[PDB]
Amino acid sequence: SIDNCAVGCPTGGSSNVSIVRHAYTLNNNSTTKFANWVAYHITKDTPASGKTRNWKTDPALNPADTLAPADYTGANAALKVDRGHQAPLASLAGVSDWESLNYLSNITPQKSDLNQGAWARLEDQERKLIDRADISSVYTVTGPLYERDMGKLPGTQKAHTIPSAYWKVIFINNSPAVNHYAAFLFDQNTPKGADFCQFRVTVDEIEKRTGLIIWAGLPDDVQASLKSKPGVLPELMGCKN
Template sequence: MKKYFISIMAFVAFSAAADNCVYNCPTGVSGQTITRSIYTLHNNSQTKFANWVAYHVTPSTIDGPSRSRNWKADPSINSANTLEPNDYTSAWATIGTDRGHQVPLASFSNTADWSTLNYLSNITPQDSDLNQGPWVDLENAVRNVVRSGQDVYVVSGPLYEWYFGSLPEADESHTIPSGYFKVVITDVNGWVEASAFIMEQNASRSDNFCSTEVTVNEVESRTGLNIMPSLPSYKESAVEGQLGGLSSDLGC
């Protein structure tokens, strides 16, 4: 009976991960995978931030009421491997960063588990101009696609290519990202389209996210990830090697 119960729990976890990811969740780097009802996250114990997050935005998950931001350490991660709310003290005043959601709160405001997005495993110190400028503009564009009736899968995460700064009052070693990637994917009866974007921490608030579009291949090259590991090989070059798969849908 115990073995049977464990098998069922493993199946439930796999099914949830499959719902959050399209063509399986990313592979290529080590860390702790945490699967929740509305997102899957891969935590890095060295940087203290997620290597990647994956989520599935649908018409039923968006356009809920305004939700609060009550920051908490992730209860599923050892305290040595993640940050706590006090670590962000004075961050905006000293290095100009917001607590930036990697899985956006607004994309799941109509769900019961929205508060899990305020776990600090889903947060990074994101430059205010980036967070409140082109990054949120892209997130809004994704939700506009969903409002047209189209489900969207997203994989997002950090880049570490140059030194940005450090949280002045954090008591754990950590590495703040130099930039971020976001891969936006649709799958309609096996017809897969994708657009990828890379934005730097020194972006201007007025920057147009469309100008940051790259190929999925470039994201994979710069992160070491395989974004869609089970994508059939005959689709890879068209989906991952070319620009513009979803550009027009996203308003570019």
């Protein structure tokens, strides 16, 4: 009964079953050990600050198909990666099953510079949208990309594939068919001081590089015309041109 997608969750994910929670809907990849995509719905009631971070193995998944807290041991030192959230903590921590935002199925090893730079900045702006009087929902779908070998976590013997990039597709209110939207894509190697506005892309580009079909419940003509046109939602997030 929880729709975190509004216009159809993505198709093309490796699992045929997705986990549905108030915090988000997620489709896990048992080979890479990271979710293929995470869809969430921010509203005036979902943000919450100051919640703690108790990393934990997702109890809804088989332990062999996801990572455990022990698997990240030595990762920051070896790879300079942080435990980065797919669905953001602060934007959604007000929901009833908020601890699930810290389940490792909702985390990936994200380079600190990206995590603490452009990515955090986009999270801040995405959350601020909900403060606008006429904006009542923010629907986001986010996920990783796997384009080049990024190495391996040193503290685990599990087969996993560290993402080389991350993307986020966002629209407000009801549907991209009538409402402003945006898509961003950042490579793991994005410098710490990078301006997130420099990474606007089309949804089509994301689809082609991930094998997914986002906003899959939209009429074909709407999908055809809007997926190849960068949106204007970033202009409300402080970007120009």
